[PDB]
Each structure stands twice: as C-alpha cells, then as structure tokens.
C-alpha cells in the first residue's frame, strides 16, 4: 500500500513518432484488398 502506481511513474516516458495521416474510409479497405488478395495470395 505504501507503494502504488510505482511502475507507471518510473517508466522512461517516450516521445511518440508523428506520422503521415491514413487515407480513411474506402481507401483503407481498398489498400487492404490489393495488399492482401491481389498479391501474393493462395
């Protein structure tokens, strides 16, 4: 009880890598379809 939330404070807190934003909606699913089913595929 003396020690609580110790692990969370004592982590070496990390800067997030900022990224190009994803194409939403149909493009996400189209980008999956041709990545997955076009090639190389069973």
């Amino acid at each position: 009880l003396a020690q609580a939330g110790k692990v969370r404070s004592n982590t070496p807190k990390v800067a997030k890598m900022d990224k190009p934003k994803e194409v939403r909606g149909r493009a996400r699913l189209r980008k999956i379809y041709n990545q997955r089913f076009l090639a190389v595929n069973p």
Binding site: R26, R30, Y33, N34, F37
Partner: protein
C-alpha cells in the same frame, strides 16, 4: 414506424467468413462490411418468403397470386432470366448476383466511370443521372429496363466548368 435493415453476424472472429467478405467488398468497391450484411438481409426476405410459398400446395390461392407477383418483381430487378423464371430458382441467388444490380456496378459495366471506385465518385459528386433525374445515391438498384438509361448528369462532364 421503423425497421432494422442490416443484421450483425453470429460469430465475430471466424477466418473463412472474414476472408470471404473482403473479396466481395474488393470486387464491388464497397465502404464497410455492413453494406454486405444489408444485402444478405435483403436476400433473406426474398428466400424466407419463397420457401413458405414452396411448402404450400401446387394449386392453392396464395401460391398463384404471390408466386406470379414475386417473379414479376425479380424480372424487373434483372436477376431471373426467362429461362429460370420458375420459383425454385428464387431459393438460389447469391449476394454476388444482387450486388451486381446496384448503380455503382452498373456504371462500371457501362464503363463511364472507368473503375468500380470511380463509379462511386461520379455518383457521390452529382455527375450521373437516370432518365433526366440526378442520383446522388450510390446504391440505387437498376431495373434492366432502365439500365440502358445511365448517363452523365451535366456538371463537370457536360458543363466543363473547372
């Protein structure tokens, strides 16, 4: 009042069902996985109606009126040919047949859009019409009669404005 047009699937994380449903979405150029599940639910009300008709006698007053009326409505939609117009062939039909009758895909067959995705863009941006009437909606369902009448609405395609 109201109704539930699509239904959710029974089991979420089946491999075969998810792997099936991507290459219906990919071929017909589609937004979500729910825009399948409505067309599954549309196929249900066709077939549940059909099967009940099948159970009845071959002469009953209900079958004669309904059976002729049911096949009339599907010959409009252009699923049943006149070869297959005989009531048992209603219990066939797939989502791949019923997806093909939509406006998105009928533009593509027409080739005006040039792509399944392109067809969606043409309809969503007010370019396409059906007998002098604009259709914003990318799931119209065209009745074969009117399939011939698919054409450019006016704007960029005809007007030529930037």
């Amino acid at each position: 009042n109201f109704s539930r047009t699509f239904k959710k699937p029974m089991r979420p994380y089946e491999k075969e069902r998810m792997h099936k449903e991507l290459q219906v979405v990919g071929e017909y150029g589609l937004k979500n996985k729910r825009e399948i599940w409505r067309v599954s639910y549309t196929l249900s009300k066709i077939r549940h109606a059909a099967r009940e008709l099948l159970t009845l006698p071959e002469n009953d007053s209900k079958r004669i009126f309904e059976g002729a009326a049911l096949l009339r409505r599907l010959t409009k939609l252009g699923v049943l040919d006149e070869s297959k117009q005989k009531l048992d062939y209603v219990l066939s039909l797939t989502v791949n047949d019923l997806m093909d009758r939509r406006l998105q895909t009928q533009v593509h067959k027409r080739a005006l859009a040039n792509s399944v995705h392109h067809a969606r863009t043409l309809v969503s941006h007010r370019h396409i019409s059906v007998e002098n009437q604009l259709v914003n909606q990318p799931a119209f369902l065209v009745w074969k009669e009117s399939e011939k009448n698919i054409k450019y609405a006016d704007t960029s395609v005809m007007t030529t404005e930037k």
